[PDB]
Amino acid sequence: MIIPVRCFTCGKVIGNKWDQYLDLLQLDYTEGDALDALQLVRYCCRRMLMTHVDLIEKLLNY
Amino acid sequence: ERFVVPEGTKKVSYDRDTKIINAASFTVEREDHTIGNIVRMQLHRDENVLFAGYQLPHPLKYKIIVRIHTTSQSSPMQAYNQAINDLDKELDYLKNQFEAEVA
Amino acid sequence: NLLSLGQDSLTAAYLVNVEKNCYLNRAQMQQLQMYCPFQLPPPAIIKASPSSTEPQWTGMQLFGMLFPPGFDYTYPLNNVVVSNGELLSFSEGSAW
Amino acid sequence: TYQRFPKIKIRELKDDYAKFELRETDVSMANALRRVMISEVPTVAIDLVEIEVNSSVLNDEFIAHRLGLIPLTSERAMSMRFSRDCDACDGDGQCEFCSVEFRLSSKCVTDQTLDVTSRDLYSADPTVTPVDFHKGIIIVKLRRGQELKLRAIARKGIGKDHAKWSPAATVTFMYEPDIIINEDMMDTLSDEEKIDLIESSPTKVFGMDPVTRQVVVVDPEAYTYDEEVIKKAEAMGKPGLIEISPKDDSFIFTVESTGAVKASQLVLNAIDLLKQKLDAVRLSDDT
Amino acid sequence: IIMFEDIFVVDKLDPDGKKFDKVTRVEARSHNLEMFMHLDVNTEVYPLAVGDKFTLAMAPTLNLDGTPDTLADKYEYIMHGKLYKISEKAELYVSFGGLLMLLQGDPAHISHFELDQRLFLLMRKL
Ligand SMILES: [Zn+2]
Ligand SMILES: [Zn+2]
């Protein structure tokens, strides 16, 4: 399961922000600061970017 | 499917109320709260209009019923058309203001 | 009777008959009158403040449009009196 | 008895973000404008997807669903006709008015994982190019091999159905409250109570002026209508210390687009569609 | 056109709360006539404090010289209701849309009130 697009509750495009979110998490950035750097002021988009689980990696490996 | 008006059915139908004089019900097909609420609010501005309201009894059946009661000075259809014209003029004025503000 | 009001109906009736401090203006009253079969009662509240126009309707008169004009009801326990289809008084209890 | 005269003042305007103030109008007009711009403004989006190679691990319907949600430039949405209305063609491939063809072909011939983004999506009409923000929206990730080739068609649609033709993104409006302070009961309050009253507000709506040693109203548009300061004042024993009421004839609009159309263009299209709806609703006189 | 007109002073409030957000029944005793009154007044919209003096009037119609069913400018707390119980020191029971009023006085003071009639309630706090 890849990162969902269009932020089901809000409708904002969040498909192209997963790589940036992972890159920010790679550095010394907390989840809140990383979400703020992506300009997500509504907590629905923050939930969508925070509650996603990367499952496609296991599908490709297995 | 729901967007298309049913074939052979007019959008607006006029039905006079026999019990109450100067009372009529307008059934608008394929309409939502957007038109009904603004029409109801515009009708209240008219002094001749006494009763103005709309209802959506069945969400599945996309219809809007508008009831207009007026004094002995104007017909309900006349008030309805006047409200529609006033709303159109307001929309034109708002569009002009927004176009001026953008530039 | 086999049929009762129901959860939401009972709660809404209790709220509209107990508060007595919230008034409905002409627009909201006429919007709610569409579902009610009977005609609109007099506002019974002409002026509430020296600078308040737009005479309002009380909550208990809204519930009064559910009774026929010939209907008469009296519930001594809750102090409920209905004369000519109009709810005259009510104190508390919601037992009726 | 006659029309209103709304006034519009734009505070901030951008390609996808617009914030303006609407005054001298009823709440119904603003609500109808919001509903029209969120559910009635048409855009172009992929609805029909035809695939030939689907060696990717993801299912075909999942790929089609995530392809249909990709935002596309919709500058021609108003001029384009509906597929059901288009009578020149039954609907197959590219059409001059309704259908726009999209071609996608991805083949991975390297050890590194290949990401099928939205950038490698080509269309016959350059005006319907998908909006570019970055790396683009990731569609499918492919290992070595695992080709993915598909043909897609995008058609004009309303945002009411499938909620994918909606350009708006949570368009809002507030009442723009006005703050009234008695300024006499504040003198009776002590310095400690003023700080507690300031801290009671969930957002920065009131400020403490050090020179005058009294509270002031700063940024009154961020009140959010939470009755926290009023409840705190009532608890402290001052019932009418702060009186806040919404303004019925003043509004502040916040319009955020998805990139399909400009926010100002979105507002203009919403106004035009509302005008067309009123014209259609208009009933001719009968004798 | 005014049937009963008198000056009243509030004695006590049954809720006696500033921010109760509830209808408060007021108790007022008449001056020069010795009449006791119960009235449900929304304190938040129309503030009344113990010890205040207000005038009270009751008229079948607000029009001048007939036309039953322009005194609006004079007063500020107009109400409309009906009298349903005249049983007694006679007393009156008038309900203004569910807001009960109990005017207890003397049999001679209140005698021109009929049963099941519509009457108004004019009140000004001086
Ligand atoms: Zn969101
Ligand atoms: Zn076509």
UniProtKB/Swiss-Prot annotation, chain A:
Pfam families: RNA_pol_N (PF01194). InterPro entries: RNA_pol_su_RPB10, RNA_pol_suN_Zn-BS, RPABC5/Rpb10. Transmembrane segments: none annotated. Keywords: DNA-directed RNA polymerase, Metal-binding, Nucleus, Transcription, Zinc. GO terms for biological process: DNA-templated transcription. Coiled coil: none annotated. GO terms for molecular function: DNA binding; DNA-directed RNA polymerase activity; zinc ion binding. It is found in: Nucleus. Its main location: nucleus. One of its GO terms (cellular component) is RNA polymerase II, core complex. DNA-dependent RNA polymerase catalyzes the transcription of DNA into RNA using the four ribonucleoside triphosphates as substrates. Component of RNA polymerase II which synthesizes mRNA precursors and many functional non-coding RNAs. Pol II is the central component of the basal RNA polymerase II transcription machinery. It is composed of mobile elements that move relative to each other. Component of the RNA polymerase II, IV and V complexes. Interacts with NRPD1. This is DNA-directed RNA polymerases II, IV and V subunit 10. The gene is NRPB10.
UniProtKB/Swiss-Prot annotation, chain B:
The keyword Hydrolase does not apply. Keywords: DNA-directed RNA polymerase, Nucleus, Transcription. GO terms for biological process: transcription by RNA polymerase II. InterPro entries: RBP11, RBP11-like, RBP11-like_dimer, RNA_pol_Rpb11_13-16kDa_CS, Rpo11-like. One of its GO terms (molecular function) is DNA binding. PANTHER family: DNA-DIRECTED RNA POLYMERASE I,II,III, DNA-DIRECTED RNA POLYMERASE II SUBUNIT RPB11. Gene3D superfamilies: RNA polymerase, RBP11-like subunit. Belongs to the archaeal Rpo11/eukaryotic RPB11/RPC19 RNA polymerase subunit family. DNA-dependent RNA polymerase catalyzes the transcription of DNA into RNA using the four ribonucleoside triphosphates as substrates. Component of RNA polymerase II which synthesizes mRNA precursors and many functional non-coding RNAs. Pol II is the central component of the basal RNA polymerase II transcription machinery. It is composed of mobile elements that move relative to each other. NRPB11 is part of the core element with the central large cleft. It is found in: Nucleus. Component of the RNA polymerase II, IV and V complexes. Interacts with NRPD1, NRPB3 and NRPE3B. Pfam families: RNA_pol_L_2. It comes from Arabidopsis thaliana (Mouse-ear cress). This is DNA-directed RNA polymerases II, IV and V subunit 11. One of its GO terms (cellular component) is RNA polymerase II, core complex. SUPFAM superfamilies: RBP11-like subunits of RNA polymerase (SSF55257). Signal peptide: none annotated. It comes from the Eukaryota. Its main location: nucleus.
Curated annotation (Swiss-Prot), chain D:
The lineage of its organism: Eukaryota, Viridiplantae, Streptophyta, Embryophyta, Tracheophyta. SUPFAM superfamilies: Insert subdomain of RNA polymerase alpha subunit (SSF56553), RBP11-like subunits of RNA polymerase (SSF55257). Component of the RNA polymerase II complex consisting of at least 12 subunits. Interacts with SHH1, CLSY1, NRPB11 and NRPD1. Interacts with IYO. It comes from Arabidopsis thaliana. This is DNA-directed RNA polymerases II, IV and V subunit 3. The gene is NRPB3. It comes from the Eukaryota. GO terms for molecular function: DNA binding; DNA-directed RNA polymerase activity; protein dimerization activity. Coiled coil: none annotated. GO terms for biological process: DNA-templated transcription; stomatal complex development; stomatal complex patterning. Keywords: Acetylation, DNA-directed RNA polymerase, Nucleus, Transcription.
UniProtKB/Swiss-Prot annotation, chain E:
Keywords: Nucleus. GO terms for cellular component: RNA polymerase II, core complex; RNA polymerase IV complex; RNA polymerase V complex. The keyword Methyltransferase does not apply. One of its GO terms (molecular function) is DNA-directed RNA polymerase activity. PANTHER family: DNA-DIRECTED RNA POLYMERASES I, II, AND III SUBUNIT RPABC3. This is DNA-directed RNA polymerases II, IV and V subunit 8B. Component of the RNA polymerase II, IV and V complexes. Associates with the mediator complex. DNA-dependent RNA polymerase catalyzes the transcription of DNA into RNA using the four ribonucleoside triphosphates as substrates. Component of RNA polymerase II which synthesizes mRNA precursors and many functional non-coding RNAs. Pol II is the central component of the basal RNA polymerase II transcription machinery. It is composed of mobile elements that move relative to each other. It is found in: Nucleus. The keyword Nucleus applies. It comes from Arabidopsis thaliana. It holds the Pfam family RNA_pol_Rpb8. Belongs to the eukaryotic RPB8 RNA polymerase subunit family. InterPro entries: NA-bd_OB-fold (IPR012340), RPABC3 (IPR005570). Coiled coil: none annotated. Its main location: nucleus. One of its GO terms (biological process) is DNA-templated transcription.
